[PDB]
Amino acid sequence: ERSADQLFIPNNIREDLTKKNLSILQVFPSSGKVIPSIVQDYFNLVPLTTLFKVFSNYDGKAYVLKRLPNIDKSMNPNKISKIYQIWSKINCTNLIKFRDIFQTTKFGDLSICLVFDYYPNSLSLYDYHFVNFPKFPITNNYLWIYLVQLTNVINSIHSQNLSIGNTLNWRKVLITGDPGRIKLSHCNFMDLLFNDDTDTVVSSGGSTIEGQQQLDYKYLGELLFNLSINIENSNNNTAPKEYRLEEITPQSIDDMRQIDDKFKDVLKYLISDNGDSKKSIHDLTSHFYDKMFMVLESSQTYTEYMESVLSRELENGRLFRLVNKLNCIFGRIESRIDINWSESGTKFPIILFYDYVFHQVDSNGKPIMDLTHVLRCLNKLDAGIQEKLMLVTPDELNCIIISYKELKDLIESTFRSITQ
Amino acid sequence: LQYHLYAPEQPSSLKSLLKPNERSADQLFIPNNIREDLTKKNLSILQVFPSSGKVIPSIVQDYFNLVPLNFNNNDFLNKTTLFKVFSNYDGKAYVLKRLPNIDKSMNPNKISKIYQIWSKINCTNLIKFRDIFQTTKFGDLSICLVFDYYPNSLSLYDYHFVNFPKFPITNNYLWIYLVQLTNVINSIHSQNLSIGNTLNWRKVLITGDPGRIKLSHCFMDLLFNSTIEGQQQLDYKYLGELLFNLSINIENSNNNTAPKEYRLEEITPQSIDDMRQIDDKFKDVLKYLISDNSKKSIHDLTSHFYDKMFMVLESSQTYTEYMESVLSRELENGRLFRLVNKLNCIFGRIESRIDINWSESGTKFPIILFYDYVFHQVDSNGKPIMDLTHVLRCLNKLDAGIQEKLMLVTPDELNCIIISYKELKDLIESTFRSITQ
Amino acid sequence: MLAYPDYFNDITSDGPISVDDETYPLSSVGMPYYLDKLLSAWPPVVFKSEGTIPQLVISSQNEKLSTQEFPLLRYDRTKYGMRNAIPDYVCLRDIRKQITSGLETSDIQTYTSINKYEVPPAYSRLPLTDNFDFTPFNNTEYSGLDPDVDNHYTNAIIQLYRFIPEMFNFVVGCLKDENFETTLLTDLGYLFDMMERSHGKICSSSNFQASLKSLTDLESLCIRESIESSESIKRNMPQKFNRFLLSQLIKEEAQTVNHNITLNQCFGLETEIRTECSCDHYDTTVKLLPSLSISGINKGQNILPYIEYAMKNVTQKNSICPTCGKTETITQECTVKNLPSVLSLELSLLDTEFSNIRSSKNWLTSEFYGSIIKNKAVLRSTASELKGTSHIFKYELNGYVAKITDNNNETRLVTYVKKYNPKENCFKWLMFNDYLVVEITEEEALKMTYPWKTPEIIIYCDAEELRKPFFSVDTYSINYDILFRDYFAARREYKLLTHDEAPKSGTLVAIDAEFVSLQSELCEIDHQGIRSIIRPKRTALARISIIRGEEGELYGVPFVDDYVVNTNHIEDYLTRYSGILPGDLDPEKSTKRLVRRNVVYRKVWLLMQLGCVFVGHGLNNDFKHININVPRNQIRDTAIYFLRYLSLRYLAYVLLIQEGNHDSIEDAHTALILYKKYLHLKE
């Protein structure tokens, strides 16, 4: 649908996130050495086929691995070190972070592999807007947001004197989270890695970094152009047309039909080469202005929403801890045949109480599980309230009376006794 | 009225000593500050106090369950202007501000006009403006305004120097303040409306850290019985007053020294140049705000700092991801909790306890064994221990349908059973349903 | 009463909400006011479990017999351990990185650390190992073993057995005869000869390991059953290996010409097992076992009761008998009749018992006295403490192999041993970790207090027999026949030796060898340029050629020219650098093909024993891959000091021609001539 700038608000959040962590957890492949069991600090590989989802050993934090399938010969280790040192320091919200590059023989061919942070169920803009059903048709606002975030990446990358490269095309930049959060991926490491000579000492002629630095502007122009133009093809379900710097002409961006003329000016600035370009983040942003307020606004809005939904849910963690501890204490094998845990013993009330909360009898005839019962019992126990509960043995002749506080103290004492 | 006993943070030394893979109990869950804030919010919104028909309105317009907020009044003389309200439609509450003893009935057309104009404008960092209306329930012929609530919000003044334990006010935050205030200014001027000169320390509240700044009152004169442009430029100076005044008391803030306040009249450019601890760019910005004309435009002001704008955006986005992460984890914790409840329901049944191993039937045996596996943990060397992240992994994996296989061992250690998580989920749910009917 | 709804809690709720309802938030019922800490508060415990790298005559059950369709029941030692235990966590990055020299040379031999929990440098993992000479690690006269073999942990065990006088002297003794049919016994004999001969530098177990691996292609069923990082898993394996090795060696010592069966007497335990039940009728069996496995319940002061129980115990297991098919819990009672000259202890215990052992002081007894009374073996610390026939055997601790788990929680094996010094009538204690050897004090040797150390295998020997001296093979008269004759299980020509030439001390012979790679060295490179070698190179012998050195050059006829025919499924044959067929495999190989079975190795070894000098382009690489080392007296070779090594084919043209594919005999011959040049060239 079309909305004001609430823009980062997704249609169904709980479904999305649950599906996300679920997607994170899944590992199918095992047997074959087509995909090896363990690589360096990385294991539990699943294909996404040159590209895998992996669980690290060191972090234990899921990451993704890119295979980069064949290499002529042994890589000069110093170059790898250069790649790592250079890109590990850079931090950007809209650029997926680079954690570790390495060279391995484990594929039984000579492969060099990259590792990136995981952003599950992320799809490329190509897939998101045009092909994948149902497709959300690019609204000018969203386009503006896209432009702003990519611009952010431009600023962050250029500020550290590096060029992003020819990866600015839409298919290589994916979206993370359904509605608006954008991130790009690869950044053309191939230039720095596969070159025999880059000594980063310019002669009087000067460095070649600037030219590429402008090229990035041009590529951004290409992406945004293609998206902006294929809008009608998006609204009605249809296949897109692709364009390039070579193919792109200003007469057509002026001949565009639904676009804010401001965006036309921006695209014009990006795509055009001038006798003196000297393109800076400053000028382009001078074109931008308020759209930054748009993305920030949407961002804050989403934050507020998430806080709101989180508020309802926050208590459950505590409950998790409680049931976890009680569960730890209750059924241990050694505890099964102990005299203490018997019908006459100190520990017996624990079994009786646990039975009371979790094991319910309907009309004395069958089991039922009431949730509010469980929460009430657990909460009251956690609070340690002086209130009395009457428990049955149940050889039905005699009974025991116990207060929630005493239950609390007893349970913690038992747990501490088991542990340490 | 308050409890910090919910959970003690683990000692800092331990956190320092922690290896990268190694986790601590708090890190699995929501950190304390956010949960406390949200909890206070929930309590403050939810609290309902008893009422008298004659002391206070039973119902007003579309609103009910009124409670006064006695603490916020500048009125000082008369009973409180602002009340907390529950709407009939939708709930979620809201805030109401009373305007008592009006001279004479104002025409409905005027009210409709005011409503349309101020409703038309929508901006975050500007407290949303809700239904405005005039009612007799006060019998003072009173006209009242309605705002979004935004709970436990403190004024910047109260935020840094007094209300909480004093907070250090680093310039970095100042940048964010500037950006957000610039946003509300641009948004209101986009509708050509004039700002209210409410821009001083008070009435500007912060919510949603890091630093989400918002203006509240935002012009009341239009209700009452220089040109637009003049005021529109005039406010720049006001914003300047705010930021400068904040800027000078930073040192007083760090040591929680008492603040000095300055009016826009007292402001001297040389004095601005004199100050330290501030980025010369921001100093230049303040200089731009205070100085008299070359009409002041949003264009130039925003034109001064591009990079820091990106910085603020970056911080906001990062925080958003953080909040998403925490939300995901706790929602997961809830689901996992429910799962543990079902597992618990089946396990340890009284009916089942007359065998040395606790499975009553043979069908239920594997799930029970699994229970033993997850909850009853043994350390190597043979001592009992309870991990959580292990528990989280097993439970999480069980919730999903994945084919990873388990060797489950009997309490004899003689025997084992081989089973896949899909079969376990199906078994647990089916069994649970069978027991429950 | 308590049943839903109870009046206590449920009284507020009109109907049950199901646990599966997502619409109903958990926050729905608030906690009341609390003046005390919550139970849900979690104690300051560190969590090490996440990011753990996975995988490092009866059936069914007795009382568990209520089952679904699902169960398969085999368990314990093979897979995991005590029920539901959490696996220890090891991080690979920390595992593969650590050592160059360690940055330390001199302080590495310190076996004691002031911290109780801290693992001393000596026990720490030693660096892996062109050619590098590690001097500082061993100051003793007793050789250490190389860590690089297919599975290195075995070394720990072998070194132990090396110091058992009976074992060593016997196995080295069996070298006197051919005994080619027995792989393990012979190869172990040669290995023994290596460690014995060189009072000095290290020896490798490679040929032994290879032969063993080839062999695995009732005890065999057991070790195969236990069989499935590459090196990582010591899980339960070393115990099993002990049993397999001992038993197999007994099986092989039968096959020797004399059928000496000395091991059968020395390690032999008569085990009498009586089964009491019906449908089995009655069954009693007696079988000789090499080692006893220790388990137990207390029903202590020190180790001895465990041993006693191991020697006489009655246990009840549920069995199905082949006699009559009735399946029921059956009771078996087993007692051992005799006390061996040397006994080996395999420790399989609940880890809790390991803890309890760590708690006790001097739990391992340096020495004990024992004898049998009634049918019941009894073992006590002092002669008087037991009364009886006063026919008592004195058992002293010969040695033991212990598992070490360091702070990184990786696992390695180490050997503690005791050696007699005849002069001064003294005992010395030594620790062997791979190529590291340290002379250590008794108090440290017996101390069990350390948490990382766990006992695995313990070997006890008779006091009188232990003090008997070690004897090298040199005392025996040795069979030289394989030198003088031919055994082949096509090459153009060669001439076997006769009795006239008399190769002896001073004799000159020439040799060269050619190898084939069984595995390729594979590297992994992380950031910051660290070469991680995973899957080390495995190389096997391919061709060996030895030619006569008598009378100077003289005869051009080879003493022996042999192909070894070993099939491990080679990766690459290195045909370019050395001519190889391929297809030297026994069934289809046209060449004189001999299973190495030490035989070529025997030729070279008997040669070096006799002390005949060796000639070659270089001795070291070849001999290193032959898995034999020879003293510098025999060592002399052509290659001379130059800015590493010197290349022979290069030098040939300089000394006056050369070809791409070079037979080994050619290199050897040219080499011999080059040495002849080197002598007369003098200044």
Side-chain angles (χ1 to χ4, degrees), chain A residues 204-206 208-214 216-217 219-221 225-226 228-231 234 239-242 246-247 250 252-253 256-257 260-261 265 267 269 272-276 279-280 282-324 327-328 330-334 336-343 345-360 365 367-385 387-388 390-392:
Chain A
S204 166
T208 173
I209 183 78
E210 302 181 359
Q212 298 181 342
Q213 206 145 44
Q214 314 285 304
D216 294 13
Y217 282 67
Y219 281 109
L220 176 153
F225 174 57
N226 296 315
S228 41
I229 282 282
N230 280 288
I231 176 178
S234 163
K241 179 194 66 177
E242 299 202 337
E246 313 176 356
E247 305 221 317
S252 61
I253 73 105
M256 291 194 68
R257 42 277 194 288
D260 287 313
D261 290 293
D265 297 355
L267 295 177
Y269 175 93
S272 165
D273 56 68
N274 192 348
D276 64 318
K279 303 186 172 186
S280 169
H282 174 273
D283 296 332
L284 179 57
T285 320
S286 173
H287 285 211
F288 290 152
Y289 276 171
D290 50 58
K291 305 305 170 171
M292 309 194 57
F293 285 158
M294 293 186 36
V295 50
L296 180 148
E297 192 161 13
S298 183
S299 178
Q300 294 192 357
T301 304
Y302 183 53
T303 299
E304 284 183 2
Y305 180 81
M306 288 199 299
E307 279 181 7
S308 160
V309 50
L310 182 54
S311 59
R312 291 166 61 170
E313 296 293 335
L314 59 85
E315 284 290 355
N316 51 28
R318 173 183 65 75
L319 280 71
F320 182 71
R321 282 167 285 202
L322 182 55
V323 288
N324 207 231
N327 274 285
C328 170
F330 172 74
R332 306 202 89 93
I333 170 175
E334 61 281 21
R336 213 160 299 197
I337 56 104
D338 281 337
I339 304 97
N340 299 332
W341 281 82
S342 82
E343 192 170 332
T346 69
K347 309 310 191 196
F348 193 40
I350 303 177
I351 295 174
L352 289 184
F353 178 66
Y354 186 0
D355 277 348
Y356 168 60
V357 182
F358 290 69
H359 307 157
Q360 304 278 289
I368 291 291
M369 173 155 275
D370 172 284
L371 189 57
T372 169
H373 181 115
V374 179
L375 282 101
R376 208 166 212 91
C377 293
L378 293 173
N379 283 341
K380 280 195 285 165
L381 176 141
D382 196 10
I385 288 288
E387 182 161 326
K388 305 185 183 180
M390 190 168 285
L391 291 56
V392 286

Side-chain angles (χ1 to χ4, degrees), chain B residues 201 206-212 214 216-218 220-221 225 227-228 230 232-233 235-236 238-244 246-250 253-259 261-262 265 267 269-276 278-283 285 288-291 293-294 296-299 301-334 336-341 343-353 357-359 361-363 365-382 384-387 389-392:
Chain B
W201 299 357
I206 187 179
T207 322
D209 48 12
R212 288 204 293 289
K214 302 193 165 170
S216 61
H217 190 253
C218 50
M220 72 166 285
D221 71 334
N225 302 25
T227 54
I228 301 176
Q232 287 188 324
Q233 177 170 349
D235 57 23
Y236 284 69
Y238 283 153
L239 180 59
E241 183 175 357
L242 176 60
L243 276 64
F244 174 57
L246 289 186
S247 173
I248 180 57
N249 280 318
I250 176 178
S253 163
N254 270 334
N255 289 331
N256 67 21
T257 315
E261 166 156 28
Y262 296 89
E265 48 172 300
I267 310 312
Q270 177 128 133
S271 299
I272 304 193
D273 280 345
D274 281 9
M275 167 182 308
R276 303 263 193 267
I278 298 303
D279 292 319
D280 291 293
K281 173 177 283 180
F282 182 77
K283 195 173 299 181
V285 171
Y288 172 78
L289 273 75
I290 307 298
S291 286
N293 287 137
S294 63
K296 304 185 172 186
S297 82
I298 310 173
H299 175 91
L301 176 56
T302 54
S303 290
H304 286 69
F305 49 101
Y306 284 111
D307 50 338
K308 302 306 168 73
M309 213 164 294
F310 284 68
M311 179 192 70
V312 171
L313 263 68
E314 193 96 342
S315 183
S316 292
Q317 295 189 312
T318 48
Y319 187 56
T320 59
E321 282 185 1
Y322 180 81
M323 182 67 58
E324 176 174 327
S325 75
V326 171
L327 184 155
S328 59
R329 195 135 29 93
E330 295 293 333
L331 198 151
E332 189 190 43
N333 292 336
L336 282 185
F337 179 62
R338 284 167 174 100
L339 183 55
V340 176
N341 207 42
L343 249 177
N344 273 131
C345 170
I346 314 190
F347 176 77
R349 295 289 308 198
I350 170 175
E351 306 166 348
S352 184
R353 291 201 273 280
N357 39 10
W358 271 4
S359 165
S361 165
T363 173
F365 190 91
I367 72 101
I368 295 173
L369 207 168
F370 177 64
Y371 181 104
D372 278 348
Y373 169 60
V374 50
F375 290 166
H376 307 157
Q377 304 181 331
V378 182
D379 174 24
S380 167
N381 195 346
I385 189 61
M386 169 155 274
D387 174 283
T389 170
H390 182 188
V391 179
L392 284 197

Side-chain angles (χ1 to χ4, degrees), chain C residues 620-621 623 625-631 636 638:
Chain C
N620 285 91
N621 265 337
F623 275 155
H625 292 281
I626 301 173
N627 191 147
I628 184 56
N629 44 18
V630 78
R636 303 298 312 211
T638 70

Side-chain angles (χ1 to χ4, degrees), chain B residues 5-8 10-11 14 19-25 28 42 331 334 337-339 341 357 361-363 365-366 369 372-374 376-382 385-387 389-390 393 407-408 410-413 415-419 423 427 429 432, chain C residues 18-27 31 33-34 37-38 40-45 47-51 54 64 67 70-71 73 75-76 79 81-87 89 91 94 350-356 358 451:
Chain B
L5 279 176
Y6 185 86
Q10 296 79 335
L14 177 141
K19 281 298 179 289
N21 62 94
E22 292 171 346
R23 309 299 186 79
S24 53
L28 291 72
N42 270 66
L331 198 151
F337 179 62
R338 284 167 174 100
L339 183 55
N341 207 42
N357 39 10
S361 165
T363 173
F365 190 91
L369 207 168
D372 278 348
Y373 169 60
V374 50
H376 307 157
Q377 304 181 331
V378 182
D379 174 24
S380 167
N381 195 346
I385 189 61
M386 169 155 274
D387 174 283
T389 170
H390 182 188
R393 295 191 285 105
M407 186 79 68
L408 294 183
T410 45
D412 52 37
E413 287 168 17
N415 305 124
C416 67
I417 296 93
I418 291 294
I419 194 165
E423 288 166 342
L427 192 53
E429 188 64 21
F432 177 39
Chain C
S18 172
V19 59
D20 273 333
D21 182 291
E22 314 269 354
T23 75
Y24 190 103
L26 297 88
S27 72
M31 297 180 62
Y33 180 79
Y34 58 86
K37 176 164 74 167
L38 280 62
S40 59
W42 205 275
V45 195
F47 286 51
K48 289 176 64 177
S49 84
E50 187 137 328
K64 288 66 53 170
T67 71
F70 285 176
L73 293 323
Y75 211 58
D76 207 281
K79 292 311 172 188
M82 30 216 69
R83 180 175 71 82
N84 304 139
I86 291 89
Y89 160 76
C91 48
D94 273 324
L350 297 84
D351 300 336
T352 70
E353 294 287 71
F354 287 142
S355 296
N356 299 122
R358 287 170 213 186

Side-chain angles (χ1 to χ4, degrees), chain B residues 19-39 42-53 55-60 62-72 75-78 80-81 83-86 88-89 91 93-103 105-106 108 110 112 114-115 117-119 121-125 127 129 131-133 135-139 142-152 155 157-163 165 167-180 182-190 192 194-196 198 201 206-207:
Chain B
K19 281 298 179 289
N21 62 94
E22 292 171 346
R23 309 299 186 79
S24 53
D26 51 338
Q27 295 176 333
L28 291 72
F29 297 141
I30 174 162
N32 303 28
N33 49 35
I34 296 183
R35 180 256 298 96
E36 275 170 340
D37 290 341
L38 278 169
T39 305
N42 270 66
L43 187 143
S44 295
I45 291 180
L46 263 58
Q47 61 182 34
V48 55
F49 277 174
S51 73
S52 306
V55 78
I56 268 298
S58 47
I59 178 91
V60 51
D62 289 343
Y63 304 135
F64 65 86
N65 275 341
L66 295 80
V67 39
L69 295 79
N70 305 326
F71 287 167
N72 313 112
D75 209 344
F76 205 50
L77 57 95
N78 199 329
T80 306
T81 172
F83 303 147
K84 169 177 95 54
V85 165
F86 280 12
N88 187 300
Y89 183 39
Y94 295 113
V95 184
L96 186 154
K97 189 172 188 212
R98 84 188 276 269
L99 272 59
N101 62 45
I102 195 181
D103 58 41
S105 166
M106 279 168 190
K110 183 192 302 182
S112 176
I114 304 180
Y115 178 49
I117 66 167
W118 292 105
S119 166
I121 67 104
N122 61 89
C123 173
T124 68
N125 298 138
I127 306 314
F129 175 91
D131 199 336
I132 170 179
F133 57 89
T135 324
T136 60
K137 276 294 204 155
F138 291 167
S142 304
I143 182 171
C144 52
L145 315 178
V146 179
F147 293 162
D148 286 28
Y149 195 105
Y150 293 161
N152 211 326
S155 58
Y157 181 47
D158 294 355
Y159 185 29
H160 292 178
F161 303 150
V162 53
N163 195 313
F167 276 177
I169 186 175
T170 178
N171 57 31
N172 203 26
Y173 270 168
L174 292 179
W175 282 108
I176 305 164
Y177 293 122
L178 198 181
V179 173
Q180 294 180 117
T182 306
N183 181 26
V184 51
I185 290 180
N186 187 331
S187 190
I188 57 107
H189 283 342
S190 69
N192 199 13
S194 166
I195 206 57
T198 63
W201 299 357
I206 187 179
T207 322

